[PDB]
Design an enzyme around this catalytic site. Sequence first.
Site, PDB file in Angstrom:
ATOM      1  N   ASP A 112      40.861  20.137  14.953  1.00 56.72           N
ATOM      2  CA  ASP A 112      40.886  21.803  15.254  1.00 56.72           C
ATOM      3  C   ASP A 112      40.348  22.463  16.742  1.00 56.72           C
ATOM      4  O   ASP A 112      39.712  22.015  17.347  1.00 56.72           O
ATOM      5  CB  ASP A 112      39.111  21.644  15.109  1.00 56.72           C
ATOM      6  CG  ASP A 112      38.108  22.725  14.695  1.00 56.72           C
ATOM      7  OD1 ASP A 112      39.157  23.817  15.086  1.00 56.72           O
ATOM      8  OD2 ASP A 112      37.135  23.356  14.996  1.00 56.72           O
TER       9      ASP A 112
ATOM     10  N   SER B 101      48.463  38.789  22.253  1.00 57.95           N
ATOM     11  CA  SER B 101      50.053  38.653  21.502  1.00 57.95           C
ATOM     12  C   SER B 101      50.144  40.081  21.971  1.00 57.95           C
ATOM     13  O   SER B 101      49.606  41.012  21.765  1.00 57.95           O
ATOM     14  CB  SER B 101      49.921  38.555  20.209  1.00 57.95           C
ATOM     15  OG  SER B 101      50.771  39.412  19.346  1.00 57.95           O
TER      16      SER B 101
HETATM   17  N1  LIG Z   1      37.112  25.490  12.006  1.00 53.88           N
HETATM   18  C1  LIG Z   1      35.688  24.542  12.179  1.00 53.88           C
HETATM   19  C2  LIG Z   1      35.583  24.765  10.673  1.00 53.88           C
HETATM   20  C3  LIG Z   1      36.733  23.223  10.571  1.00 53.88           C
HETATM   21  C4  LIG Z   1      36.105  23.684   8.599  1.00 53.88           C
HETATM   22  C5  LIG Z   1      35.976  23.446   8.297  1.00 53.88           C
HETATM   23  C6  LIG Z   1      35.479  23.430   6.719  1.00 53.88           C
HETATM   24  F1  LIG Z   1      35.797  23.790   6.040  1.00 53.88           F
HETATM   25  F2  LIG Z   1      36.008  22.354   6.852  1.00 53.88           F
HETATM   26  F3  LIG Z   1      34.394  23.051   6.381  1.00 53.88           F
HETATM   27  C7  LIG Z   1      34.530  24.213   8.796  1.00 53.88           C
HETATM   28  C8  LIG Z   1      35.060  25.117   9.758  1.00 53.88           C
END
Ligand SMILES: NCc1ccc(C(F)(F)F)cc1
Length: 330
Positions: free
Chosen positions: A35, A199
């Site tokens: 992430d 962008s």
């Molecule tokens: N961007 C952060 C994030 C990543 C994944 C999820 C989920 F979908 F796995 F719950 C929520 C928040």
Amino acid sequence: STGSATTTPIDSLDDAYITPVQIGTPAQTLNLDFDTGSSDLWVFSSETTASEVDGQTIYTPSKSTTAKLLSGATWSISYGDGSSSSGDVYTDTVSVGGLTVTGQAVESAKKVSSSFTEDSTIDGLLGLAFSTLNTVSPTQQKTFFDNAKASLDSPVFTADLGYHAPGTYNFGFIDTTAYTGSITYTAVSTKQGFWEWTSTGYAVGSGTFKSTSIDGIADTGTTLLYLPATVVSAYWAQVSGAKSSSSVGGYVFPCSATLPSFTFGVGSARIVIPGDYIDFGPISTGSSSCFGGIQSSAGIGINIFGDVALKAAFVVFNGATTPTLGFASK
Ligand SMILES: NCc1ccc(C(F)(F)F)cc1
């Protein structure tokens, strides 16, 4: 040193991507969501309340000879979609695709929101934004990338996400065989802790390119493409029968429609997202209404170049002292 790991979509819609990560001694392999929009490495663990675990692999610090409790440290995060988690902090050895970091802060989850519990394929998140966003208190912690920076051949990592197919995260080198043409680099603002860039405009289908500045973040942890309401309205106006639905919470379109491509600008370069990438399937099983991959950022407060955009490109995250983002066609 370098590292290279395969990343895999968790479902047939590319809702998220998981990458195996080795934690502890001996290794405990967990599949984490890489992430670039957050900065906490947190995992389901033996300390997570049992009713909130449903099929995830858990990290057990007591079985790791290198794990050490970071005395007094806690962490608490809430994400832009409403999800949240919290717990305590260990330090342990963490390895990604051969690249090893000792003394990495491993945040053990004691409580997780329901959206993580129902996502049985994701054992945690590995944050790759800038370390100023790390939520560990009272002593802030460094990301995996930050800790590895000195040992890498080059202070970069690259994201090569696949469309309905596996992809690659590389640490410390740029694979010149994975893209076509040349890489276009653009400036990054770290003022909010994100991989934030600007962008230079957009185009819908074969329409004329509209030069306009769109400030947004490159976020591998967000599924969709979130852009200003003016841009998003101009895209969906070209799809017959498309409309914004409040009950669904976004734009939907007839599943029988063909979607036009979307182009976004990087300096003088152009990245083209195929229309097929913007189809996220029926809003419910059997429905003939389909959910769109381009949505408005008005309620979010920030524009997000999520997986829909990033998987159309080879993306270089350059963590030099003056950070930049590189985009190349592939
Ligand atoms: N961007 C952060 C994030 C990543 C994944 C999820 C989920 F979908 F796995 F719950 C929520 C928040």
